[PDB]
Write a protein that binds this ligand. Structure first.
Ligand SMILES: O=C(O)CCC(=O)C(=O)O
Ligand SMILES: O=c1[nH]cc(CO)c(=O)[nH]1
Ligand code: NI
Length: 333
């Protein structure tokens, strides 16, 4: 019913008014839920507008994130990312080093490699046994950092549950089917800062990007982006298409676990972040926030009802959600 957020090269990413799922009469609620599902089943991406998270709070959260990344290099490494099983803390991709152990076939590539021009900080739920968040010190500009981000984590946690309900309603299964699979909130709030960079850097280092192509791992990802642009989604014809920023929208995409969970009725689509499409000498800083939603780590993941007719259509063996994720997170090391 809304004009598509993206409509190019066979890639159609719908723009959906989420308040119509939450506040509509039964007919409108079903129409919206079906629009949401259909978006996931085709593009694997949707844009939501009029979500319960408020614009001025989102802007406060973006300012708060920007204050963290202005912190000195040493203060950010203090709260550094440790292990894949914690998946919490600060990181910036380093350049790989040639060493005595390295194979000479790889040396030409290692020297030419260009790491993503980004830095990140990841926050998990506060009360996970054995995995506390490495919070920075609450002083000067970072007073309120914790309470703000925990607040935002819980609002995104609520939105996750609501988007899965829309998926359930659109599938015509029990509206609350996913609740017990996602109620723990084993999610990851990834704050991202892509620093100001000269456009010539992308010519000097050919193949250089802001974020490498990938699929996300979990159920869904709530992606809040600023107005800079650069996010691209891969079309059915194999081309990366610009996911244009639209004010007060959240870009929502399915991850590999939901794809598998859905018996591949829902798509998990390749995406990346390159230079903004506009031509300029210097690209200003880009801020985004990726809230990775996952099934409960304890959840066992096998085909959702109504995603297959005969058992022979089930493409995948059952897996534990938690184990799967750590394998994805630990693979690159
Ligand atoms: O920054 C963005 O717009 C996308 C980042 C992303 O896809 C990710 O962190 O997984
Ligand atoms: O926890 C994470 N980290 C990174 C990704 C992909 O960028 C993901 O999907 N989930
Ligand atoms: Ni991603």
């Amino acid at each position: 019913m809304e004009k598509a957020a993206v409509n190019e090269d066979g890639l159609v990413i719908p723009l959906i008014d989420f308040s119509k799922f939450l506040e509509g009469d039964e007919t409108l609620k079903l129409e919206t839920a079906k629009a949401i599902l259909h978006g996931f089943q085709t593009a694997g991406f949707i844009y939501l507008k009029n979500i319960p998270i408020q614009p001025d709070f989102r802007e406060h959260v973006f300012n708060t994130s920007a204050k963290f990344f202005k912190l000195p290099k040493e203060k950010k490494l203090e709260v550094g990312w440790t292990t894949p099983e914690a998946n919490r803390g600060y990181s910036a991709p380093g350049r790989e080093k040639v060493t005595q152990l390295t194979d000479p076939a790889e040396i030409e590539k290692i020297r030419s490699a260009a790491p993503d021009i980004k830095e990140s900080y990841e926050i998990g739920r506060e009360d996970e046994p054995g995995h506390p968040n490495p919070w920075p010190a609450e002083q000067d500009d970072l007073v309120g950092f914790k309470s703000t981000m925990n607040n935002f984590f819980d609002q995104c946690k609520a939105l996750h549950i609501e988007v899965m309900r829309a998926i359930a309603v659109g599938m015509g299964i029990d509206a609350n089917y996913f609740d017990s699979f996602v109620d723990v909130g084993d999610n990851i709030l990834r704050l991202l800062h892509y620093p100001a960079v000269k456009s010539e850097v992308f010519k000097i280092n050919p193949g250089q990007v802001r974020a490498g192509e990938h699929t996300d791992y979990g159920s869904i990802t709530l992606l809040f982006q600023d107005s800079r642009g650069g996010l691209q989604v891969k079309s059915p014809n194999g081309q990366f298409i610009d996911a244009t920023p639209i004010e007060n929208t959240v870009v929502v995409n399915a991850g590999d676990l939901l794809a598998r969970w859905s018996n591949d009725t829902i798509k998990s689509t390749v995406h990346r972040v390159v230079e903004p499409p506009k031509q300029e000498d210097v690209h200003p800083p880009r801020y985004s926030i990726a809230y990775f939603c996952n099934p409960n780590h304890k959840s066992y993941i096998e085909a959702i009802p109504g995603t297959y007719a005969a058992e022979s259509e089930r493409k995948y063996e059952g897996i534990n959600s938690g184990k799967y994720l750590v394998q994805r997170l630990a693979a690159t090391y």
